[PDB]
Design an enzyme around this catalytic site. Structure first.
Site, mmCIF file in Angstrom:
data_model
loop_
_atom_site.group_PDB
_atom_site.id
_atom_site.type_symbol
_atom_site.label_atom_id
_atom_site.label_comp_id
_atom_site.label_asym_id
_atom_site.label_seq_id
_atom_site.Cartn_x
_atom_site.Cartn_y
_atom_site.Cartn_z
ATOM 1 N N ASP A 48 0.872 -1.202 0.000
ATOM 2 C CA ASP A 48 0.000 0.000 0.000
ATOM 3 C C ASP A 48 0.905 1.247 0.000
ATOM 4 O OD1 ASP A 48 -1.800 2.034 0.537
ATOM 5 O OD2 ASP A 48 -2.883 0.916 2.067
ATOM 6 N N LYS B 235 10.135 10.561 -1.357
ATOM 7 C CA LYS B 235 10.964 10.675 -0.117
ATOM 8 C C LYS B 235 11.911 9.471 0.033
ATOM 9 C CE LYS B 235 10.788 10.749 4.880
ATOM 10 N NZ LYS B 235 9.928 10.764 6.068
ATOM 11 N N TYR C 208 -9.615 14.202 -8.035
ATOM 12 C CA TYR C 208 -8.615 13.679 -8.991
ATOM 13 C C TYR C 208 -7.763 14.838 -9.525
ATOM 14 C CZ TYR C 208 -6.474 10.962 -12.672
ATOM 15 O OH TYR C 208 -5.550 10.322 -13.445
ATOM 16 N N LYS D 105 -3.699 15.577 -8.913
ATOM 17 C CA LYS D 105 -2.715 15.591 -10.034
ATOM 18 C C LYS D 105 -2.046 16.964 -10.198
ATOM 19 C CE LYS D 105 -3.121 11.219 -11.065
ATOM 20 N NZ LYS D 105 -1.918 10.373 -10.981
#
Length: 226
Positions: free
Chosen positions: A61, A120, A153, A157
């Site tokens: 996940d 990261k 959405y 984005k």
């Protein structure tokens, strides 16, 4: 001295096409998707191994900090990380009038938080190696021009582009590029096979693409222009 890629959301569609193109490009590839697509992930792995490359399925996940950290650690252990493609995303249609927080947060958790955590832990691993790197995320046409009934959405984005530009500045002293792809009509607008997105990711992942960073590139057959 083979370069190693992770591709997230790689069980099918865009992600699978990117993973198989990087394998064809000569990279060893780790493919991630949700646990329930484990069988499809195994198929992709066998196709990458048929090209004479090394491959690993890493179900996880990408919205979970611990999952992404373990996923990058497992790839470093097994394959020996030079390219991160943060491709996992979900599309749900829901107007702002009809917005449910659990749809809103689920879209943000995979589309943005997942990208941040991949950015990261890839970056930290690449800084440690001292050989530079390539970090590439899925934006969308919806990240360049917001779309009706896709407020969550579209927001997610646009946000991918913001963190791409911020990360491109942070990681430039370590020679890590951070870019995004913004696909349009991928299978009356133009439409194309996912190979056209895999082709763009393949190019951005190359050593000679070191001077392109912080860019979000439209691959949509000329519907939006930037």
């Amino acid at each position: 001295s083979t370069r190693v890629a992770i591709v997230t959301g790689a069980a099918q569609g865009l992600g699978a096409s990117i993973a198989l193109r990087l394998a064809d490009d000569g990279l060893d590839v780790a493919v991630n998707d949700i646990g329930s697509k484990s069988d499809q992930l195994q198929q992709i792995v066998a196709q990458i191994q048929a090209k004479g490359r090394r491959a690993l399925a890493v179900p996880a996940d990408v919205s979970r900090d611990v999952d992404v950290q373990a996923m990058v650690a497992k790839v470093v252990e097994e394959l020996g990380d030079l390219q991160m493609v943060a491709n996992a995303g979900i599309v749900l249609y829901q107007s702002l009038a009809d917005t449910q927080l659990e749809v809103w947060d689920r879209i943000m958790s995979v589309n943005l938080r997942g990208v941040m955590l991949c950015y990261k832990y890839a970056g930290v691993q690449m800084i440690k190696q001292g050989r530079g790197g390539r970090i590439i995320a899925a934006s969308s046409a919806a990240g360049k021009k917001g779309m009706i009934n896709l407020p969550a959405y579209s927001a997610s984005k646009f946000a991918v582009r913001g963190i791409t530009q911020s990360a491109a500045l942070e990681f430039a002293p370590h020679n890590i590029t951070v870019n995004a792809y913004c696909p349009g009509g991928i299978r009356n607008l133009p439409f194309a096979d996912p190979e056209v997105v895999a082709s763009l990711v393949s190019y951005l992942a190359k050593p000679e693409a070191y001077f392109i960073t912080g860019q979000s590139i439209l691959v949509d057959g000329g519907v939006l222009f930037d």
